[PDB]
Amino acid sequence: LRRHAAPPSTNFEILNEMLNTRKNMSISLESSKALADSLDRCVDPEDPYFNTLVRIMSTRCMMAAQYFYSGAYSYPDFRHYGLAVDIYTHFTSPIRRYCDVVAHRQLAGAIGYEPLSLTHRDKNKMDMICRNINRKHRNAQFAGRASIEYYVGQVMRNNESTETGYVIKVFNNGIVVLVPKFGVEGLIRLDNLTEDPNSAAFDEVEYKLTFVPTNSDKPRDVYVFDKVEVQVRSVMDPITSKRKAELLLK
Amino acid sequence: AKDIEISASESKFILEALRQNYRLDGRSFDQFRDVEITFGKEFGDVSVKMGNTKVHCRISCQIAQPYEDRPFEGLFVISTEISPMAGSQFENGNITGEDEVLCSRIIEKSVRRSGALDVEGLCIVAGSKCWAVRADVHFLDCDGGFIDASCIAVMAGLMHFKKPDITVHGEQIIVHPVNEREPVPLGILHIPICVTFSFFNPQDTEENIKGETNSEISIIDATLKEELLRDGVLTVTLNKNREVVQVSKAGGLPMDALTLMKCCHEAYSIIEKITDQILQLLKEDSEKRNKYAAMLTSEN
Numbered sequence: 446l447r448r449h450a451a452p453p454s455t456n457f458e459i460l461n462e463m464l465n466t467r468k469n470m471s472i473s474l475e476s477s478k479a480l481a482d483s484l485d486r487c488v489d490p491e492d493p494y495f496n497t498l499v500r501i502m503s504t505r506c507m508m509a510a511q512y513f514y515s516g517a518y519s520y521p522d523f524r525h526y527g528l529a530v531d532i533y534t535h536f537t538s539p540i541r542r543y544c545d546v547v548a549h550r551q552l553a554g555a556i557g558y559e560p561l562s563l564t565h566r567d568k569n570k571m572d573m574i575c576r577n578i579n580r581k582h583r584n585a586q587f588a589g590r591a592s593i594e595y596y597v598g599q600v601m602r603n604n605e606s607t608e609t610g611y612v613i614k615v616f617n618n619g620i621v622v623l624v625p626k627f628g629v630e631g632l633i634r635l636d637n638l639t640e641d642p643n644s645a646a647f648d649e650v651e652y653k654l655t656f657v658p659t660n661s662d663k664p665r666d667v668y669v670f671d672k673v674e675v676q677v678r679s680v681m682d683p684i685t686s687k688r689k690a691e692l693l694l695k
Numbered sequence: 696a697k698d699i700e701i702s703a704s705e706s707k708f709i710l711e712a713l714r715q716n717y718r719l720d721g722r723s724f725d726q727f728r729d730v731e732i733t734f735g736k737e738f739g740d741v742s743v744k745m746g747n748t749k750v751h752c753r754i755s756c757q758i759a760q761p762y763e764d765r766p767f768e769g770l771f772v773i774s775t776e777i778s779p780m781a782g783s784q785f786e787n788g789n790i791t792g793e794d795e796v797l798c799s800r801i802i803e804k805s806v807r808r809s810g811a812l813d814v815e816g817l818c819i820v821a822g823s824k825c826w827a828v829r830a831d832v833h834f835l836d837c838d839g840g841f842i843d844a845s846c847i848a849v850m851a852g853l854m855h856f857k858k859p860d861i862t863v864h865g866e867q868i869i870v871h872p873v874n875e876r877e878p879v880p881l882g883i884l885h886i887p888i889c890v891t892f893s894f895f896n897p898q899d900t901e902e903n904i905k906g907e908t909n910s911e912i913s914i915i916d917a918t919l920k921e922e923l924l925r926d927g928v929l930t931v932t933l934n935k936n937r938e939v940v941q942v943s944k945a946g947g948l949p950m951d952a953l954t955l956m957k958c959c960h961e962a963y964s965i966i967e968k969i970t971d972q973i974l975q976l977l978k979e980d981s982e983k984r985n986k987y988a989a990m991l992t993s994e995n
């Protein structure tokens with residue numbers, strides 16, 4: 446089977462903190478439907494992409510779904526939060542998922558087509574299969590996302606363009622902006638963020654970072670969830686040899 | 696002990712009837728008796744009936760501490776003490792007799808050893824507190840087939856039984872009564888079913904040892920009269936997964952290997968029908984208890 450644990454309150458307390466402070470909103474977390482409804486109404490009229498940004502950000506604070514065998518947990522633990530179903534598994538893709546192969550053999554024995562192999566009726570062997578495909582699943586998505594990272598990083602290799610960015614993380618050492626066009630997150634250090642780093646201030650209560658831009662002299666307050674203009678640029682670090690995307694806001 | 700006297704006439708008649716494809720109850724050589732399963736009010740209370748054979752099983756459990764060797768496993772025992780109620784042939788408490796120890800060992804190897812019950816799921820807190828499931832078989836009336844009747848009685852009971860729900864606060868065990876929250880069923884890895892074959896030599900020993908053509912007769916699920924006149928016994932246990940749980944032909948009349956294999960395949964068709972039968976009677980019992988629960992709440 447395959448279950449999905451309900452997200453802890455601690456994961457959304459930080460998101461609701463930024464929402465209630467800046468946008469004056471909140472996510473219920475009372476139920477999956479409550480979480481969905483509150484996430485749905487979380488939309489800014491001046492910018493349609495704001496709702497998408499919150500969704501792609503509230504996805505990062507969800508518990509990882511995992512494969513398992515029905516003897517390892519009780520029935521209420523079979524619950525899949527993200528789908529709101531009492532029970533679930535993978536079956537539709539046996540060519541690209543070994544989990545579906547197991548499910549196929551079990552269904553064949555379920556209908557009486559052919560007796561189920563002993564290896565799929567051993568609680569010990571099933572535990573090894575589940576712990577393996579869980580690890581291979583994580584390694585698959587990470588390798589997949591890394592493949593996107595390299596090719597996109599090669600597109601912006603020798604190119605600079607003013608794209609649309611969104612502030613997702615605010616710190617005293619700088620900010621982190623997300624470019625939806627390339628799907629790449631970038632870090633703008635305080636030294637390259639503004640002039641006179643000793644004059645800049647960070648308010649944790651409001652998630653606001655006030656500073657004076659390098660090409661200006663007017664105190665600008667940069668809050669969170671703000672749509673800002675950002676110049677993209679790629680440079681391979683001479684120490685890590687990883688193609689990172691250096692971003693300069695405007 | 697107290698013996699059952701069998702005349703030469705009765706011995707010759709029942710054996711000759713077998714030579715003419717006749718058995719007294721009118722069954723067939725490969726025909727298993729109709730198994731009737733009745734559940735009591737409480738969970739774990741099951742009554743199995745095969746013709747005149749009557750057995751009753753009761754599943755119970757209590758909080759106990761696991762063995763030092765197995766801190767993650769719960770306790771599980773099966774009791775099958777005979778009594779003069781099933782007949783004066785049985786001595787009260789005779790748990791060392793040949794047939795008694797065999798029967799006790801067949802059930803144990805079919806349920807306990809086979810791991811039909813998930814003993815790992817009987818653990819509440821590792822190496823401290825666990826459930827101790829007990830299966831008590833009561834032999835009410837004997838007309839043969841006590842092994843097959845017991846194996847069905849134990850399994851039907853275990854699948855029907857439900858233990859009180861438990862929430863754990865460290866080592867503090869909160870045992871919820873049936874009044875507060877509903878009880879929790881047991882974990883069954885597989886459903887073992889026993890089928891016993893009885894062998895008869897229509898000729899003499901010489902033709903069994905050195906005889907060219909085999910002629911030994913084998914019948915399924917013998918009655919008491921057929922059981923007292925057999926020359927060999929075979930108990931084979933299988934499940935719907937097409938696997939042999941255990942086979943026990945402890946001596947007796949030497950039998951052809953291919954014939955014993957035929958019995959195993961014949962038994963598989965029986966255990967399939969029996970297993971599905973048990974499951975259906977469990978569903979209807981669940982539907983009955985739920986329908987009454989709805990009629991009790993509506994009237995409340």
Ligand SMILES: [Br-]
Nearest residue numbers: 765766767768
């Ligand atoms: Br253990």
Ligand SMILES: [Br-]
Nearest residue numbers: 719720918920
């Ligand atoms: Br009879």
